[PDB]
């Protein structure tokens, strides 16, 4: 069995193919602005644009057409509306066109769910990306979350602080390269809040910290980014205790960071438990995750009507029932 | 509709009747326990004894006959195996002998779920009794576990403490009494063991503290009971707070005490919502909230089969979909 | 906090021990009336010559003194004025022999308002008692009478039907019970009258049918519980349509009905809304409810001044302003 | 004391100046259409064009100034929120210019108070027009609803009737001339549902009997304002009943119908209770009510702050307190 998969809940559009066991596609396009943030009208252009050129180059690198794919699949959300909106429309097209079933998919479990088509079984899964920040595990028949961001996304959050140092796009590895260098570790505001993740007390703070002058500036990154990642790590160790499973895995464009790999590693060799960072393809915004979780489902019998195919621009990880695990 | 319901996870046999909005008998029997603590064997032994007579009781108060009867429910779980047998074998021959469906209650739903019967919506839950401490609440379609003791119950370690403290059964009241003239915190360990609870640590280092004689037995009774009830204060807000529900509920038989109660208060009026107590016999272990919860179940479509009515020692919370809400 | 609460409005004086969560208290007694009806004088003797016993009694239970009282809440109407008398008379001298404040509380209101302290939000309520029958509900800062009886309370009717046909005291339970093999509705006087209910054309016309030896017992006192309550149930659904609430409560000492609960239900159930009887002790006259309530006016800063406390034999559901809700 | 009250809830913009005890002014448009039905949009237009002239032409009529008036009055709600907006900004541009005291007036309210103005008392008040109808009366310090269309106004509901037999603009008047030759009652739906009105079943009923052919127009006008009549004449006799007042407001554009006055003076002189229409120019859509009733308030020391004058386009009558009474 084949499937094809839609995204756009943000700024990348992916479309990818896979079968069962094989990524036969997966093909990419992220908007690149100067300024960097959120900007919901300009990506949904992008998505439209990008639509046909993608879709003709997928279908070509794995060499098969539409009438080969068995469903189709898109990221229902959670996300930007008009960007969902855009994917959601374009899948609608091709199902009523070729009579494929129709699935829709949550972003979030796709990007957990891929993990599954490497040889890991039942991870706590850490979702890091620009605006999302999430330790979802499955537990009683769903993705259940352990700790989200209560504001901001730990990517997004990484970008304001580099741009008030003046670095330059893409704020990431920027940062981190800085961090590599301070020693001094400066106390800044904990990240934990109760159960979930707050990174807006700690980013103002470190922003404050920055414009008195008083301390290096690589010295505040480092801090920055500690704590930061000490809070991921902590709700990460968390869910692992209670949840008792023997696996974790990190997700999300901000997977590409290594000294929060080194962190969790760290963390999953004390409790001696596996650690797994799928390839930075299938780690960052990409169709074949949406593909690939799309295709289990419908191997387990769910099929969309075009009724239960809305765009969900806040779709909850537990709202999706796991019949195919 | 009637349903009738026993209870028997621990030491109380207990046997409800009651109507979407009634309760028409709620009786009692509990094994008298010398020393104090869990014993399976002399429980079992007391439910079997006593089940008839009970029965005959609970019948005569609700003033109806078995005939009368719609449904039979039964605590299948968790609790003690012996005693859990006792109860189920019971259920199942009324369900023969008078032609009755029956469904398997869990024990701690039913706590919680006990509340929605006088008013309560969707309760984040603080279930507290001898062995069993969880914060629970409905949540994707299951009653999910936000923080759970990993060894003893609050209940039996108040009472290891008052048994140390060579105080007459039953412990609870008595130490409560004591901590009210307490003025003096004196620092135990924290209760709080990442997502859970944890009362161990705290109970022997209180013991060891009493026995060095340093201390005046007010000041560690109030210390006790701020340190293991804080922590249970802590649980409960950070479910609160995650979850977003609106009303609180304290239910168990160490619901009690009066200074658990304050402490709940306190934080529910903080973040301006509500809180509720059931009634004292609705509240400790009794067979009217596994009736009210049967009920309920079976007005859904819920009918077991003999095999599904099996005991569960071990019943998780989130085993089952809560599909009556 | 605490509040101490007396009831005597009628033959029960009941007196009630109550804080934010729990009932400490509620203990009853009530004057033996052999031909049944109202005898205002007995009453006030009555509850003269009970006060101090089972204001005694109720401290014993709640085990506390009034000192730890926080403040008195008497009803203060509507009732027999020698009754109320002697109620506010005893709870001022309580007052200035304790240094505590005083409220009066409106005996109607607190029969709704208890069902708050165990979950209920804003329902329309309907209380049915000997001698009161008001459907009301809260809107535009009071409880507001959306139907009343023009003449005799449901219970007092249901009770000189009984006597009439010889049964022994208590009248309703035994009507009831005829009422189970009725096979045959006679027609008897509709007894909603515009807004609001009467009950005296129906009473004598069933009387009148009784006398007559051509009809069954059983068809005649279904056909009278059914005319009366489909009333009942009208002019509740009437509050229930306009108000949109999405809760009714059913309260006062006819609330034992299960005829008239059955059939609010099928009512509720029908519009797919919520339906809740407080436990027996709280439904009918008692002094906890009156607790209740006189606890969350003070909490919002209603302390009476003794000119205030003059009893009120006509008291208007509407002339209170619900300031705590 | 003067006061200055701008009214635009609908079709009519009404700038009016009153004393306590006269009207200084009255001066009026209507927007006309020639199809009927709402036009928000269009209003709004009218409401800003008509805005200069109306003031300065009742300003001349009652020979003042703004200096002279005291008060600024304002129909804030209920109605059209777009037309609500245009009046609210010219209000408050006044207040802001002339440092004069500010008040939101309730529409519906100030339609029941202008009576007062002519030595009615406490009236029951039957407000009637395009979109409203509403039985309303003080009781427990609001003016409470006691019967409202569940969907389209009685003026309305005549209209559309009124097209549908091919009548031209206004529809009123031409179905009363038709209604007074009619002479056989054709049975249509009731329009009285609980406790309130409805409108829709009994219009669309009435349609398609005219479109059968079967029946005389004359006689299905007569039969359509009877029904609709009866209907207004019960819930309003249900009020005076309930109630106990003496007297009976009719008010509203539809006061014009004569037909509509006797069925209300037949009720009225049955119970031999006084019934009181206004003159026409404070029965319709006019400023002099709004500047009338805000006089009251404003007398009574009521005065808005900026904040509480945004405008409300589903404004309910209880939530004005009636402290002027």
Request: glycine residues 10%; neutral net charge.
């Amino acid at each position: 069995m084949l499937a094809l998969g839609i995204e756009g809940t943000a700024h990348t559009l992916g479309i990818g193919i896979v079968s069962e066991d094989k990524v036969l596609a997966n093909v990419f396009d992220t908007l690149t602005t100067e300024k960097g943030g959120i900007h919901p009208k300009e990506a949904a252009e992008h998505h439209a644009r990008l639509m046909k050129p993608l879709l003709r180059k997928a279908l070509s690198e794995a060499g098969v057409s539409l009438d080969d794919i068995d469903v189709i699949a898109f990221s229902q959300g959670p996300g930007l509306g008009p960007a969902l909106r855009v994917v959601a429309t374009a899948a609608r097209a091709l199902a009523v066109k070729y009579r494929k079933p129709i699935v829709g998919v949550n972003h979030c479990i796709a990007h957990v769910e891929i993990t599954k088509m490497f040889g890991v079984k039942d991870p706590v899964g850490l979702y890091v990306s620009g605006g999302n920040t999430q330790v979802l595990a499955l537990e009683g028949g769903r993705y259940r979350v352990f700790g989200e961001t209560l504001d901001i996304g730990i990517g997004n959050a990484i970008d304001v602080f580099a741009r008030e140092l003046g670095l330059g796009f893409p704020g990431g590895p920027k940062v981190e390269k800085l961090a590599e260098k301070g020693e001094k570790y400066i106390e800044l505001p904990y990240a934990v809040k109760g159960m979930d993740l707050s990174f807006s007390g700690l980013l103002t703070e470190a922003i404050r910290k920055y414009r008195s002058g008083k301390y290096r500036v690589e010295d505040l990154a480092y801090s920055f980014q500690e704590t930061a990642f000490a809070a991921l790590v902590e709700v990460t160790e968390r869910a692992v205790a209670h949840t008792e499973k023997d696996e974790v895995v990190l997700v999300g464009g901000v997977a590409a960071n290594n000294r929060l790999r080194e962190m969790l590693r760290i963390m999953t060799e004390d409790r001696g438990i596996k650690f797994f960072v799928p390839p930075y393809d299938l780690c960052r915004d990409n169709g074949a995750m949406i593909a690939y979780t799309g295709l289990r489902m419908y191997k387990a019998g769910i099929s969309f009507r075009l009724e239960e195919t809305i765009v969900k621009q806040k779709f909850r990880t537990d709202e999706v029932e796991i019949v195919w695990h």
